[model samples]
Target: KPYYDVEFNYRLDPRDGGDEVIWGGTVGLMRRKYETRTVRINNERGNEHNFNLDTHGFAWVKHKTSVTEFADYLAIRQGPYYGEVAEMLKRVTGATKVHVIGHLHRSLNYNDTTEEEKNAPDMTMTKGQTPGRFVHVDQSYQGAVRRLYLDLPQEEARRLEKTRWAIINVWRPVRKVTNEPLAVCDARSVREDELFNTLHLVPMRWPDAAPQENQMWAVAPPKTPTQHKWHYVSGMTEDEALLIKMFDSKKDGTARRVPHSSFPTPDDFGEPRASTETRCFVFWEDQEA
Candidate 1:
């Protein structure tokens, strides 16, 4: 079986009651799981890597449109591109409206940047920009509702709450991705009891001078590694992407959320990986029964 060692987070819950839980840094449990029998490769050149769509709960969507350029990362705005991506998502997922919230541009080593790059006018400050290794989801059910209120007007938000909503993430390689690639767990393999809701503290852009806020998200702590299957796309190009379903409001017969993380490819040690992950809220109007 082809497997790799990966880390999964274990968050603490105040309801269970232990000590005063601290924020920031690795405060809870970090356990290793040997994710096994999941790598599907078509050639040695890293041409194609495919996973069963039904089993893994993730899909590779080919985006023919080009987004911002490499340098445009600094001068990029959310309006046109967000709408462009939203429309693509709406067309792909059959959703009524796709509202793009925000996006994160991650360089190989985001923590360390040149003074020039850091001082660029169009740059958006993001914290802990390094490649993430823990298996987690971006939003929980409560968190998704909270996010809607924060991003939308009161009445509009209330109205949207009555309809079906979903949080979907579109991740793509800025250039060509290698070395450390993203790995997502199969939603069907995950057990309900293993998910732990935790507060994901988000930092504001530089010079904001405002207090940071935390959003509730789901993280899988260390549990018996029974059926946690993982998959990834090998050597993903700039034109390709991984469309992940993060949170779905209508849980009747769909995958509600998925746990994903970046894993290192030790064979390719010297090169750095650059990628963009855009998260959006997809809402649906009630259909006549």
Candidate 2:
């Protein structure tokens, strides 16, 4: 059994019937350790896990990048990284158009940063600097549709809204991961009844920008215990990338959103695990005459 037994962070919804949340700290928002459960996380590579982007809501790929220095996390925007990602995505999925929306680079520690790094223009406003410990979907179905408008021009969004669109998350290790590693739950294993709705608060990059409002779905363990199938690629390198299907618009019983989180290991004592997640909207051209 190529697996790790770990306790995953799960939210215990408030008893008062309110929207549960996972938020950025810039505001008065705060969340303490809610609930945790020990579960087995299978190493996909070790277990020879066969997965698909459409069926399983996630797939692993090898994508090499030229940018070697990620010490300046924000500098990825200045290079060809986004373009390369778009091209790779188009090549992999054969989509008509792929729009790179935004990205996040996480350093080792979940909290605490220098004044210089904190004040820099990292766009995510250093909000998601830490590895996500709790199980979550980056965007809810409504949130995904909302982002299409936020990330694209009005006319472009209008043109694409009529067709099939999906938010694909391309996650890669900035360095070899040895400590906190990401694990994704099989979309098929999740029941709509089990997913708890939550709000994800995104801070504005500039004072005048639209309020970057969004929502998410959080997963708690099923009462049966073995209802969720969690998978991860151990010892992932910079050349390897994970494609997580966040939101799929097609309604033919495919994976809609993949719930995922990062789990810490005993080896995670000193060094930090560095990684990057780039998100894009992939559009299908639809049936041709």
Candidate 3:
């Protein structure tokens, strides 16, 4: 199957216990630091299933022995792009809300047989349900879904008014000492090319903690109150229905560098690697304002 463009960078933090590296990095950083190892996902993170994750971009929720049409339910937003190309593509494909699920991998390849892959349970656990084939995190799946970049044909790109890009990414975030949960930012609109060229990375605990105080590391609320919507990003437990918020970097509502204890640290903060990550898909989503 043909795949879309993706850029990934990560670092290993031996102190984190897992020796797992964080994923995603800034282009400049990658060029200066991991030049040899950093490449587009198509090249760097080849289609290896060492971890054995179900790698399809489309998702389906099973319904009464039937399968829901393939669509994006995850919420990982693609970075913004600009110009006529983006506009034209948007006109063709309808936009949808999506998120990138973390840590949790969908179990669709346990058997990997024609019959097994075709099984009903192998499709998807029904909406609002989790059982043999489905598992629920303590948090809302809504937060797990983010918009993405979708591949469009050249014919589609030429017929555009303005061109923008799509970028998609997934990575790990360290935990803070506070009991507070992680906070999610509002959904912002982006273009296909922007999403395509954008890089994804997880922020590490800066040794000095000052750089993180600014936008350099932490993702903070928008400058204006209207754009800022601070909500708790709850977490899910192995058992029960209570979806608790993740350990937020800040406990008192002030954005700060995430501490290193409440959650697992990475194998290397400078390199930025990920033990668990979600695959990102990008496409155009056109909807009327």
Candidate 4:
């Protein structure tokens, strides 16, 4: 299939040189490479690829939100938008419960917007973070467990240690996604040896639970031929969302995590992508005692 020729960035293997890290100031640089491949993600006619979180580590779903005002999404404190997402996740994934741990409104157009739009009421004054370029999961195995306890009760968290739990990310575009769309790889396509957990070095939503280190899994440059099957739903609007399985605690052979990235679009044309992503802890109550 003659599709978009996109560049997927991967981290340098530690075996090849140094230990991978995020906040390596003057000591070292976080090494990485861009691999160009033909990707079939954005389908204007009809998307033929069929994927799901259980089998593919990621899935695309169309569920519109009631809170349409641009400013309402940034209401980080007890916003109805987050609960709205939780209810949607519960229905779509059939989870016993869901918790939104954190969220970020990202954009490549930090300075391209008007002051009025930027200063709108109820919206965050904070500028958005740039779309993450590296192919990585949002959290590592240990990082997910640690972040879980930040919001979950200690005893309940301990109980979940014996059941199935996951860090699933819900991503949706604030505007129509035209440039720099999101890309994801089938979890089964990537292997353990091809990745390393890098210290993300960021705090969670609650600063009171400060001093949290988030370790995210980055795909390292491969020694053998890489067989990563990548996919994306091109031209996704606020009416749609992508559920990415970051870390599933179960080990019975389901997708544990999904590695994702944002790739460059042709000629860099179209409205700068403004999207929000919510990190959640999904639990299966049936497995808990």
Candidate 5:
């Protein structure tokens, strides 16, 4: 077992989901070390012997692209990339339909003192834009549904809500990586009782408008050392991408959500890490249809 232990501070509380949204909350410092293990993905032979995405809640897929094409972080936010990524996601997940929701460009070494960071309050200093040290899921079940209404019209949202849907996040290295890398816990290993909720208030783009709310799930400190297995791809390159299941409407037998966070690398602690993550909503229609 090539696993080491590390502690993290997590937010523990049932956030305000009622009518008048309240922002800000308390924090709890937890002392627990999660295990890290090497993941063996057998691609040859149709990857039959490997871990199932439905069971583990995550899997690595090949998304080869030139370094030059992906290095431009700014270009990724604009047009064209959404469609390109949506198509790729459909091919990989085999979902009935894939919708590219949005993306967040992040850097561990991003300087908040820079001119650009100071000017763009929405981009640089946000929670997801920076490297997250705590263990958390990008979206909770309620959060996913809330985003659906925010992104689509009422009719469309109602129609889609009836079908089986999932929020999948595809993350990849944008530039060279020599610092903190992302680690994910096996969905099977995490206990249902350990899952906790936290609310995130989205900063208003227009100050006059009311702020939006997003509920996030995080892993609280366990009473004892349970079967919480963690794995990460060491020295991950730009061509490889990690597909993580954030929320699934189908509760019968599928990967609902995965707990993930960024851990500091011992050898290169000071080096900066740049990565791009795109969130998607995938819907699966009735098989008989």
Candidate 6:
């Protein structure tokens, strides 16, 4: 229960699927308070193509952003559809830039007797220089985009402050059909029956003529706003509601629920672990300076 909390970097490769994505780990600035310098995602797979070339893969994940080589995770079995869904989530969550991504491997080895390794302790690092390698099958991939969001929870008083905050950024492509901005806000969730295919978002304004039977929202061929009720609209779902509740709940069964754990606290706040870890990557359409 200290005044500040610590965050770890995480990546959601298809291999290590589940609710493993948590807020307990976030990368913060070295000196600046509350500012997240960069997020380092640990891909479960050692390979990049697994992301489904339809989206950006690991080899291209770190084209321009700042990053550090961390641990590499094993691989899993999933399809580009899941990757698409994940990217949509990233886009809606506002991950417009990409920092770094690739197979969890680095060529340089301190353990190796190469002289180059002797001079560059910090400099001679390879992309996939982790202790272990990804143990899975090979596949194609799309890409991994950058995502950004305030590491704080939702509250009117803290709304503006939260807006000013940027943490954990990931980039994802958009669907070509609607052509709407990729960074649309999504507060949707998945259903148990459907499992991972469900989506949830809030503040969605659909057109009246769009397909009502379709689960996706209707943006516009032109100015179309209304859609068929039969079509599922993008917004918060029952699963998202429960996930939020569990994330905000303090009970052991509940994940990180309090903010103190996610943010800095006052001296009187006691140890840091008591505060719950709540992180929501909400994508905003309007760009702020």
Task: Give one digit per residue, the lDDT tens place, for model 3 in 85-129.
Answer: 223223322324222222222212112322333433322322211
Query: What is the C-alpha lDDT profile of model 1 across 1-289, one tens digit per residue?
Result: 2445544433444555422221222212111132222232212124223542234456777775456464354444533667767888888777777788777776645223323245433324333355665566777677777777887788977877788877788888876675677877777767777676666653344357433444444444544443566677666788787888777776564677777877665454445688778888887866310
- Candidate 2 at 31: error in angstroms? 4.9
Best by lDDT: 2
Q: Count clashing residue pairs per candidate.
A: 0, 0, 81, 0, 1, 74
lDDT of 6 by residue, 1-289 (tens): 1112212111222354422211110111111122121211222223323322111211113222112222223221121222433353354334443112222121222223233233433322233322111111111010000112112233521443332212222222111111111111111211112112111111112344421121111111111121100010121111120011111111122121110101111221211111011123332224441
Model 5 residue pairs with clashes: 6-33
In order, candidate lDDTs are 0.60, 0.77, 0.21, 0.70, 0.63, 0.20
- Candidate that beats the other on lDDT, 3 or 4, i.e. the better one: 4
Decoy 4 TM-score against native: 0.80
Stretches > 4 Å off in candidate 3: 1-182, 187-228, 237-289
User: Which residue pairs in candidate 1 have backbone atoms (N, alpha carbon, C) closer than 3 angstroms, thus clashing?
Assistant: none
Quote the lDDT for 247 in model 2.
91
Off by over 4 Å in 1: 1-57, 68-74, 110-128, 205-210, 222-226, 287-289
How far off is model 1, as Cα RMSD?
6.5
Residue pairs with clashing backbones, model 2? none
TM-scores for the candidates: 0.74, 0.85, 0.21, 0.80, 0.75, 0.18
Residue 270 lDDT (model 5):
46
Estimate, for each residue in 230-276, the C-alpha lDDT of model 4 and write its tens digit.
Answer: 77766788998899999998776789989898876664567678788
